[PDB]
């Protein structure tokens, strides 16, 4: 039977330029091509994309961050394209050594370039957050996306900015590079005893598994009641149809309680936000307040001895 995973027929017509209120259509670019490959799964139309002041600022800063790391990777390769391809994943833009602490007196080849790239990334991410808030405000919507992004930004800042300040060294931050930051996380674990015994690390993992569980449940429910037009969730909130009722009754008869067509989204946004929220708190505590999480667990009834 048809399981609604992929569309079995595509139709296309005039491109939808979008709504127009309190929005400067000059900044909105032109509508891009129609992609049939994506049309199989979701909407085939690409664009138009709003390019405002903050959009330009974010694009410039992100381009400079990416290009700075790229140039350092080239220098680290001897400017050899073959080596650049052979060691693309193994390159690193390490932070300044612990000798300099938090000082900006690191040489450009051993710490200065990292500070420049970090400044570019900081500007890019904050400008993008401002862009998200302003885009929501232009259409008159709520700012929920801004606050979820704010949670993600909080974890990012704690990892890169606030925790090095509290520890007193730039060497505590994360090096730019694939295997470099994987090794950074592994060493962060090994230094502070098992990060597993960090209670807030456990809560963060709980909410990540919960995010996966809840999105699987919600996607399966909506695909199962899409034969009643349940995917039009805003309409269901406005005028409760039989799709919402069937979904609610399935979950009520399964586990004794249910959500509504709107509140399940409150559950979703909170189960996603708490991941980064609790992760930021746990990382902030590590090193600053606890130096050995296994011994802390032993003293707090978590570990056997």
């Amino acid at each position: 039977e048809y399981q609604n995973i992929f569309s079995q027929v595509q139709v296309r017509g005039p491109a939808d330029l979008g709504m127009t209120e309190d929005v400067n259509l000059a900044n909105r670019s032109g509508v891009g091509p129609f992609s049939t490959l994506l049309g199989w799964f979701g909407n085939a139309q690409l664009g138009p994309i709003y390019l405002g002041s903050l959009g330009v600022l974010s694009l410039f800063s992100g381009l400079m961050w990416f290009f700075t790391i790229g140039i350092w990777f080239w220098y680290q390769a001897g400017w050899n394209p073959a080596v650049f391809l052979r060691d693309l994943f193994f390159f690193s833009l390490e932070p300044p050594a612990p000798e300099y602490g938090l000082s900006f007196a690191a040489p450009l080849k051993e710490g200065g370039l990292w500070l420049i790239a970090s400044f570019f990334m900081f500007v890019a991410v904050w400008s993008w957050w401002g862009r998200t808030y302003l885009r929501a405000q232009a259409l008159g919507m709520g700012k929920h996306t801004a606050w979820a992004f704010l949670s993600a930004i909080w974890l990012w800042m704690v990892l890169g900015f606030i925790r090095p300040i509290l520890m007193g060294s730039w060497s505590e931050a994360v090096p730019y590079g694939i295997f470099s930051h994987l090794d950074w996380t592994n060493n962060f674990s090994l230094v502070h005893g098992n990060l597993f015994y960090n209670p807030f690390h456990g809560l963060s993992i709980a909410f990540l598994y919960g995010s996966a569980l809840l999105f699987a449940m919600h996607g399966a429910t909506i695909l199962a009641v899409s034969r009643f037009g349940g995917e039009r969730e805003l309409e269901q909130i406005a005028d409760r149809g039989t799709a919402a009722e069937r979904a609610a009754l399935f979950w009520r008869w399964t586990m004794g309680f249910n959500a509504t067509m709107e509140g399940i989204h409150r559950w979703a946004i909170w189960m996603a936000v708490l991941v980064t929220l609790t992760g930021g708190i746990g990382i902030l505590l590590s090193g600053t307040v606890v130096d050995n999480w296994y011994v802390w667990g032993q003293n707090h009834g978590m570990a056997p001895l």
């Binding site: 034969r227 005028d239 309680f257 249910n258 409150r266």
Partner: protein, 260 residues
């Protein structure tokens, strides 16, 4: 601040974890209370309010201001069925199935149920109807995949019920919603896209058998469909899954029936 304890082993980490437990309990309370906006208060199996209403109280009322002057909605509030239900309780005690009295597919009970929604067409952001037949939709055409128009429609009993005359499309999303099927009698019904398996030769509908294709509800205007008609048609077709099982000509279902 590393290693300093206010009392016992309690320190900054323990303070954080306990404050988080308090916050988590509060948040679960708030989320469940928000989830209690539709379907409450609880009813008995006859219609009177129940003795047990839940540990979580009902929330404060909130109002949604619907677009295009459709009005306002207040939830939670006084909610009523606004239709008659054709069911009879099988047993006196609570918690037992209610058997249908007449034809479940026409009475609109069970999996073939429907909700008395608004009898108005669905409107997009601009004020036009969100779903339009493709021939009346300017510029729309099949882009990829097997075109269903002109293919015979086959029922679950392997008998041809009609031919596809048109496709209804969602104008903003640019995705097909309904097929329009013309029967032997010349009248045209609708079938949701999610219920048809567009094959090489034919459009296959495993929900309904051919004889039941005439029983699908119809629409008032040929150039639009309202939410209520959508609900009736979708409920009918979906309830065909359970209430057309005997007529369904399935090999494995036949083997299971012979087994039982």
């Amino acid at each position: 601040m590393v290693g300093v304890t206010a009392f016992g082993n309690f320190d900054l980490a323990s303070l954080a974890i306990y404050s988080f437990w308090i916050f988590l309990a509060g948040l679960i309370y708030y989320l469940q209370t928000e989830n209690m906006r539709e379907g409450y208060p609880l009813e008995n199996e006859d219609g009177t309010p129940a003795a047990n209403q839940g540990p979580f109280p009902l929330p404060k009322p909130k109002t949604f201001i619907l677009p295009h002057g459709r009005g306002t909605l207040t939830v939670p509030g006084p909610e009523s069925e606004d239709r008659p239900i054709a069911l009879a309780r099988t047993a006196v005690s609570e918690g037992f199935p209610h058997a249908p009295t007449g034809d479940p597919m026409k009475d609109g009970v069970g999996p073939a149920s429907w909700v008395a929604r608004r009898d108005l067409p669905e409107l997009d952001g601009h004020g036009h109807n969100k779903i339009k037949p493709m021939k009346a939709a300017a510029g729309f055409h099949v882009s990829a995949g097997k075109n269903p128009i002109g293919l015979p429609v086959r029922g679950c009993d392997l008998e041809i019920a009609g031919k596809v005359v048109d496709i209804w499309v969602d104008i903003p999303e640019q995705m097909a919603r309904f097929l329009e099927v013309e029967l032997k009698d010349g009248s045209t019904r609708l079938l949701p896209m999610q219920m048809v398996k567009v094959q090489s030769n034919r459009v296959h509908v495993n929900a309904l058998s051919s004889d039941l294709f005439a029983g699908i509800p119809t629409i008032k205007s040929p150039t639009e469909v309202t939410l209520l008609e959508e609900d009736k048609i979708c409920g009918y077709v979906a309830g065909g899954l359970m209430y057309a099982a005997p007529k369904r000509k399935s090999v494995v279902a036949a083997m299971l029936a012979e087994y039982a």
